[PDB]
Every structure is written in structure tokens, then in C-alpha cells.
């Protein structure tokens, strides 16, 4: 076949990753173990640990933009509420 350019991942056998020695893997086959292990304990506990770990990264931006949105909405409401003759004109321009 027509040779192609250099590639960072080979196929099986010549996969290209660093050669290693002494690493041992295992398995127990799907049929010899219960499919649903932990199901609830891991569910609740890991779910709460994960939600605790990254809470602030989603809390802070949401709070900031919610504060902006609330302030903008309230000022817009005040603008067109018995204020179209004394405040609307001086800020529209």
C-alpha cells in the first residue's frame, strides 16, 4: 500500500506506547460477579463527594450572572414605572 505520514498511535502489537515490564493486570469475567455492586452506597456517597468537590466552580459564576440579571431586570422595571417623564429621558440619551 501507499505509505502514509507518521502517526502517534499504531495498531495492536505495534501500538507505539512506551514499552513496559512487570505490569500485571487481572479480570474476573462479567458472569462471575454481581453486575450491581455498591449500586446505592457508591451512588449516594460518591455523588455527594463529587458534588462537594466542584461546587464552587459552578456556584460562583451562576451567582454573579444571576446578580447581574436581577439588577438589570429591576432597573428596567423601575425605568418604565411612573418614571418615563423624569428618569427615562435623562438616561435614554
| x-or-dash string of contact with ligand PEF, 2-41, rule CB under 6 A | ------------------------------------xxxx
Nearest to 47 by CA among 56, 38, 60: 38
CB of 50 to ligand CDL, least distance (A): 4
What are all long-range contacts of 27-34, with beta carbons under 8 Å and residues at least 24 apart?
Answer: none
> Do residues 8 and 16 make contact, with C-beta atoms less than 8 angstroms apart?
yes
CB of 61 to ligand CDL, least distance (A): 15
CB of 54 to ligand CDL, least distance (A): 6
Amino acid at each position: 500500500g501507499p505509505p502514509s505520514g507518521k502517526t502517534y498511535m499504531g495498531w495492536w502489537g505495534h501500538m507505539g506506547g512506551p514499552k513496559q515490564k512487570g505490569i500485571t493486570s487481572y479480570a474476573v469475567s462479567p458472569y462471575a460477579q454481581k453486575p450491581l455492586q455498591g449500586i446505592f452506597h457508591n451512588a449516594v456517597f460518591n455523588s455527594f463527594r463529587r458534588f462537594k468537590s466542584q461546587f464552587l466552580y459552578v456556584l460562583i459564576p451562576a451567582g454573579i450572572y444571576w446578580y447581574w440579571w436581577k439588577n438589570g431586570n429591576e432597573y428596567n422595571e423601575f425605568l418604565y414605572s411612573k418614571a418615563g417623564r423624569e428618569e427615562l429621558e435623562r438616561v435614554n440619551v
